[PDB]
Structure 1
Amino acid sequence: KELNDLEKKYNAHIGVYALDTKSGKEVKFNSDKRFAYAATSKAINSAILLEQVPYNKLNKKVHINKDDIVAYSPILEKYVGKDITLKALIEASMTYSDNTANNKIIKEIGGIKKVKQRLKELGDKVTNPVRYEIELNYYSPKSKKDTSTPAAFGKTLNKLIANGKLSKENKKFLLDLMLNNKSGDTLIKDGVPKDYKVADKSGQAITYASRNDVAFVYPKGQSEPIVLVIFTNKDNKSDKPNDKLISETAKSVMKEF
């Protein structure tokens, strides 16, 4: 379970930050090294929008046209020239990792700048959103663009969602999407003990086998979640990642709690 020999077994780099929100106990490993967060940022944008729009007001529609459309939008693809509710945008973003949905949410929030401002209010000076989908995924170890550290990103998830200011309804709406999500089943969920419940949002950048998973993990018997951010990448641009790496990382970290 040493994270060091997980990096060896897999020849990858692991960035972890786990915070038991009950005890405040943290597990860090390369927790201050930057990683491209890819689709895991969708959790952040969704949370931020849910801060400014009451659950009852998620039924508000927003028009989607061709310009809004970006690659890998299994849901939003068909909304060209149609309206979609803020509620359905968030579901598309969280369940399907829909790229057009996420951009739209960011737009609704006020843009990247607004996202940045918010991050800064949350005391997050590390999380660096610079581009929208899908370009936020063109990770370069040379660039800080669209990257965060496991610690900065974890602290933000905590402050925004776990110990945030979301209403009961919106927090539930969001955590349930991440809970019900079957997309990151091979990641944190795969490595945690049978009885734990995992509310995650996976992600994978285009380069360096940047494969991430962030989650609200709930040990059987605990209602308070452990915020778990696992970012992983490899040395080469075209490197393919191994999800079992995240699964094994979550297994190990969870044993700390």
Structure 2
Amino acid sequence: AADLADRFAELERRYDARLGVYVPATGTTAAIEYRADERFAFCSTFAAPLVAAVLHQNPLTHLDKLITYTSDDIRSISPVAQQHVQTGMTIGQLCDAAIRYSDGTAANLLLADLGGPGGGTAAFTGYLRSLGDTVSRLDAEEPELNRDPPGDERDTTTPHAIALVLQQLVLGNALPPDKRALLTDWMARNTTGAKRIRAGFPADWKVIDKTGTGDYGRANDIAVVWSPTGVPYVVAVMSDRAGGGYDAEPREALLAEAATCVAGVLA
């Protein structure tokens, strides 16, 4: 706050970055928005609504179905799937890995499970449309979805759009309570987000999140946070550093600082 928009702009200059932030309005707080309707690549953030789509589409015990895969299926960072290729992974294990480790092979297999044209990308986009998101689009799977040139609309969402999607999934009634809890718990146990939105909120706030990182210095985090008294907020922070070209380093610190600024306003 000096003001908030000024603080975000200062961060953009510091990190030679484009920063997008959205926090939906609540009973007593106005929406926080900065470049909130600009498009940014999903990166692995899409895996959160992907898991919601797969959960919604199937009986709960579909989680117990074993999926087999092999060498040519490992095409992207896949910390868990690389370890289990010899035995296979259940849908539940794939959901766990896709969310908690940003496992790209897991995401790819879940896309294939959802099925339909574009290896599942069309049905994934259709799931978002069913939640009233007319903005986001997924066009490729991993790793290609991380590589669209700056400005290209393929594989993008916006801080505004993805926040409203996440709000419905975790806080709203997009999913029945049992599936909602599975999704929430996986994000609660995320391993990839300690230096992002989590870094910006006091330890007595609960944080669940799904990160994303890609080329052109892309670094995102979408989260639901709860105050010490149980008041929830949805926080979407997205960034890229197109000025550094394809190999621009993603800079988590930017997201941590942006989240700290948001937390200051929400406290």
TM-score normalised by length of structure 2: 0.88
Q: Which has the higher contact order (CA 8 A, sep 6+)?
A: 1
Counterpart-to-counterpart distance in 2, 1:12 and 1:236: 9
Q: How far 1:210 moved relative to its partner?
A: 0.7
Counterpart-to-counterpart distance in 2, 1:20 and 1:209: 29
Q: How far 1:81 moved relative to its partner?
A: 5.6
1:30-74 Cα offsets, whole Å, 9 max, x none, are: 001111120111111011111123434311222223343222112
Counterpart-to-counterpart distance in 2, 1:57 and 1:133: 23
TM-score normalised by length of structure 1: 0.92
Q: How far 1:157 moved relative to its partner?
A: 1.5
1:160-206 Cα offsets, whole Å, 9 max, x none, are: 33313223232222212212223110000001122111101111112
Partner of 2:180: 171
Calculate the aligned-residue CA RMSD, in Å.
Answer: 1.9
Counterpart-to-counterpart distance in 2, 1:216 and 1:94: 14
Partner of 2:225: 217
Counterpart-to-counterpart distance in 1, 2:251 and 2:79: 24
Counterpart-to-counterpart distance in 1, 2:89 and 2:218: 31
1:138-217 aligned at under 5 Å gives the runs 138-206=147-215, 208-217=216-225
- Indicate the SS of the match to 1:229: strand
Q: How far 1:99 moved relative to its partner?
A: 0.6
One-letter identity of the residue aligned with 1:214? I
* Contact 2:105/2:142 (8 A) holds in 1: yes
* Contact 1:211/1:243 (8 A) holds in 2: yes
1:96-150 Cα offsets, whole Å, 9 max, x none, are: 1111110111111121111121222222121110000011010311411111111
One-letter identity of the residue aligned with 2:95? I
Deviates more, 1:153-162 or 1:212-221: 153-162
Deviates more, 1:57-66 or 1:149-158: 57-66
* Contact 2:101/2:191 (8 A) holds in 1: no
Partner of 1:103: 108
Q: 1:252 to 1:94 in 2, by over 3 A?
A: same
Given candidates 239, 257, 264, the residue that maps to 1:248 is: 257
Partner of 2:4: none
**Number of residues paired by the alignment?**
255
Counterpart-to-counterpart distance in 2, 1:133 and 1:103: 6
Gaps of 5+ in 2: 2-6
Counterpart-to-counterpart distance in 1, 2:127 and 2:264: 33
Given candidates 9, 13, 17, the residue that maps to 1:8 is: 13
Question: Does residue 227 of the first structure (1) align with residue 251 of the second (2)?
Answer: no
Partner of 1:64: 69
Q: How far 1:11 moved relative to its partner?
A: 2.5
Q: 1:134 to 1:21 in 2, by over 3 A?
A: farther
Partner of 1:135: 144
- Indicate the SS of the match to 1:58: helix
- Indicate the SS of the match to 1:211: strand
Deviates more, 1:155-164 or 1:28-37: 155-164
- Indicate the SS of the match to 1:141: coil
- Indicate the SS of the match to 1:212: strand
